[PDB]
Symmetry: C3
């Protein structure tokens, strides 16, 4: 049984500005764990990681049906498994979370299906 579906696309450029404008931006979007990875990356890759996590958390909040509003981003965590696939390690959901992220040089995309 499907209980939610949400997608999201981000332009990397705007995540770039957000980071540049507010030094606390990434700190507010990412969890401690996520932030540790964020710090091990540098130029483009660091922004791609951040943009991907933002995209995933947004897609998840929409899958939960919050339309305008969003769940706390600190209540959501996305890590990579042994194989490099991203998944939700933390989430206010108990069912199965099917997540997928893809990206180009300028955009990042995310899709979430919730199953009960």
């Amino acid at each position: 049984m499907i209980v939610g579906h949400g997608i999201d696309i981000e332009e990397l450029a705007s995540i770039e500005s957000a980071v540049t404008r507010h030094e606390g931006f990434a700190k507010r979007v990412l969890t401690a764990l996520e932030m540790e990875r964020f710090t091990s990356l540098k130029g483009r890759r660091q922004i791609e990681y951040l943009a991907g996590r933002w995209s995933a958390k947004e897609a998840f909040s929409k899958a939960m049906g919050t339309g305008i509003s969003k769940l706390g981003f600190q209540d959501l965590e996305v890590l990579n498994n042994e194989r490099g696939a991203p998944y939700f390690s933390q989430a206010p959901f108990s069912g199965k979370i099917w997540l997928s992220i893809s990206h180009t040089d300028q955009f990042v995309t995310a899709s979430v299906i919730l199953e009960e």
Copy 2:
């Protein structure tokens, strides 16, 4: 069980040009209620609304494997889009997202 799946991506500029060419475009793509909402918006936001509804209907049509006036996408109190009308009696899981340049729509039909 899933009985259908469709997605769509649209270039916002492409939706304008359309609106620019045959101006009767929007009236043909949107329903009355949808139009009231459209004509009450302006700037980038108005084109996004149109692109968003187009994209939503395209994805749904592809999910069905198949009239836009027969489809209507509104927004609930939470701001989330959803099909208020559609030639389908099961659950329609819809999601839309957009940037300054593009819009994407994903649809999953379930029974």
Copy 3:
């Protein structure tokens, strides 16, 4: 029951750039059947056909959870059915495969949901 979900987005210019730089790119990515339709196409359309198939194969691999590692691209095939929709004619999966592809003049995206 959903057992896998994957998406992918591709900038057409990247695909165009890969064909230009590598003469046998298409041959490595497309099966004999796919290669037929491909060669019968020209310009942008040809690139878009190639990009979509690559996008679809990429989305399927993620849906399988393959992560960064990947399956044979020759082990996957995407043709068009009698209703004119793209589908996997060959895939190491025995359940239902839901595929959808879409593109602009600049990008192409694919979404795959695995069910059984």
